[PDB]
Amino acid sequence: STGFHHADHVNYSSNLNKEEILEQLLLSYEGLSDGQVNWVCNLSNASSLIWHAYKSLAVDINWAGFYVTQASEENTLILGPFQGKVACQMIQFGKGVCGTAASTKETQIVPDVNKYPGHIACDGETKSEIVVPIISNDGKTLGVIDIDCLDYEGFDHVDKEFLEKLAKLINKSCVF
């Protein structure tokens, strides 16, 4: 018996710094997703990792989750696992921060969503947001990683760098 439980992956002392917490998160995601390619499973645990990591970082986040490119027709993002309050069910590519990340295949960092044309708010209290797209081997958008913050300008290049790595791990470990 290791003495550990799955839940233990989300322990981060206030004494750890940001680089460490995020490094541990990637490693935990790797350990937890090694066993199955089931994307719901891996993304669900992934959302918890992200949520808890950010709560430990003292970034006041209110949502941490994923939308996945709908299996049906013309690219639409459909709500996937998340930690946080009830969210919008579907987003068309090109619409809002998530839809913009999906059409551009690029990371979006929004310092104030009320000054962002076309913003699609799922939580009225969200002030800033970061969206990182999950790209497949053939370079198509598979879904996005989306984090909201209750304060303006909550995210920067460090979050983008970490999230982009996590998106790579996700594509290599999940089957959509």
Added chain:
Amino acid sequence: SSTGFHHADHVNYSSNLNKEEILEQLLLSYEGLSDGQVNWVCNLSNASSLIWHAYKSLAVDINWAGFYVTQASEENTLILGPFQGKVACQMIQFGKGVCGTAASTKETQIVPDVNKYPGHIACDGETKSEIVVPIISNDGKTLGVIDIDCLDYEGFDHVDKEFLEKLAKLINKSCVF
């Protein structure tokens, strides 16, 4: 013409509402949130958030609220689905643990002390009590389970079972697994 509401508002209500009001409001929110699509991931993800916040406001110290769904490839195995809480076990075999037994017996399991539960599979070592409600198909088979963990012993009772079994039926009719 903005309604002035946001999706998140389904989980924004006073904790001064009594339990029957809160649970009845949850069933109504799930219905309105799931009307537009049969996608089960979307529907169970918002569901997990509804359940989590309802119990937080009822002042039950829960640590997990979520779902497991029967693996398509194998109808005797549960695969981790959407949830609110800490990282959890990825797969559970029918007949094993509280979740696996709710699935094999097709009966709600209300557990006051998880460590007195033979074969308990702890995803969170701090879980002390738990309730698992199986989601049943028209065909009468287990589609998955609704799973809630609590940090204190004796956190659940049959009113929870009654409302969660209604929710499970709404999930079956609203989702395509």
